[PDB]
Scaffold this active site. Structure first.
Site, PDB file in Angstrom:
ATOM      1  CG  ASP A 220     -17.461  -2.454   7.069  1.00 24.36           C
ATOM      2  OD1 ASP A 220     -17.927  -1.838   7.825  1.00 24.36           O
ATOM      3  OD2 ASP A 220     -17.482  -2.627   5.863  1.00 24.36           O
TER       4      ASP A 220
ATOM      5  CG  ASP B 239     -14.173   7.425  -5.622  1.00 21.79           C
ATOM      6  OD1 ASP B 239     -12.877   7.906  -5.313  1.00 21.79           O
ATOM      7  OD2 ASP B 239     -14.690   6.711  -4.684  1.00 21.79           O
TER       8      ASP B 239
ATOM      9  CG  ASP C 190      -6.721   5.082  -1.241  1.00 22.97           C
ATOM     10  OD1 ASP C 190      -7.688   4.923  -1.146  1.00 22.97           O
ATOM     11  OD2 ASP C 190      -6.240   4.850  -2.586  1.00 22.97           O
TER      12      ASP C 190
ATOM     13  CG  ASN D 169     -11.197   5.497  -0.106  1.00 21.99           C
ATOM     14  OD1 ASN D 169     -12.221   5.620  -0.109  1.00 21.99           O
ATOM     15  ND2 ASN D 169     -10.503   5.748  -1.064  1.00 21.99           N
TER      16      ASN D 169
ATOM     17  CB  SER E  98     -12.236   8.788  -2.243  1.00 28.72           C
ATOM     18  OG  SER E  98     -11.884   7.615  -3.172  1.00 28.72           O
TER      19      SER E  98
ATOM     20  CG  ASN F 288      -8.862   6.274  -4.568  1.00 26.54           C
ATOM     21  OD1 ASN F 288      -9.056   6.355  -3.408  1.00 26.54           O
ATOM     22  ND2 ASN F 288      -7.892   5.311  -4.829  1.00 26.54           N
TER      23      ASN F 288
ATOM     24  CD  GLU G 221      -2.971  -0.710   0.015  1.00 24.33           C
ATOM     25  OE1 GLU G 221      -3.058   0.100  -0.630  1.00 24.33           O
ATOM     26  OE2 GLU G 221      -3.993  -1.695   0.122  1.00 24.33           O
TER      27      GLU G 221
END
Ligand SMILES: [Cl-]
Ligand SMILES: [Cl-]
Ligand SMILES: [Cl-]
EC number: 3.2.1.17
Length: 129
Positions: A101, A48, A52, A59, A50, A46, A35
């Site tokens: 989650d 979209d 990280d 994110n 967003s 990203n 990562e």
């Protein structure tokens, strides 16, 4: 801060990540390697819109607030900047929520693609832990 491999393993263990939700320390170190290359200041934008953040590339669509991700949540209740600190506490605490989650470490696409099913123990080999 760019952590050493064993240095990060030790910090993750100190913060209770080792075997958290059944994921051995090597899984977490492997995820961080791919990562962020162990760099707490890593950021990536990203498609979209967003972003990280940090050693585990957490994110802003769901987990932290950066003020620039429309329609997003802040489920870890932290500014995304907290995930860039030399102190990994905020990243670890948020990762604990993420991995709980529902989909385990598959939440980290890079873990699924590069760590899952591999000899992850290699990532903590030789480390005084
Ligand atoms: Cl391991
Ligand atoms: Cl936002
Ligand atoms: Cl990937």
């Amino acid at each position: 801060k760019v952590f050493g491999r064993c240095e990060l393993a030790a910090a993750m263990k100190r913060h209770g990540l080792d075997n958290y939700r059944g994921y051995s320390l090597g899984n977490w170190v492997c995820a961080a390697k791919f990562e962020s290359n162990f760099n707490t200041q890593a950021t990536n934008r990203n498609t979209d819109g967003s972003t990280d953040y940090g050693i585990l590339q957490i994110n802003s669509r769901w987990w932290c607030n950066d003020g620039r991700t429309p329609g997003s949540r802040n489920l870890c209740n932290i500014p995304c900047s907290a995930l860039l600190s030399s102190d990994i506490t905020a990243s670890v605490n948020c990762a604990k929520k993420i991995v709980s989650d529902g989909n385990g470490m598959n939440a980290w696409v890079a873990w699924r693609n590069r760590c899952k099913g591999t000899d992850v123990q290699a990532w903590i080999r030789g480390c005084r832990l």
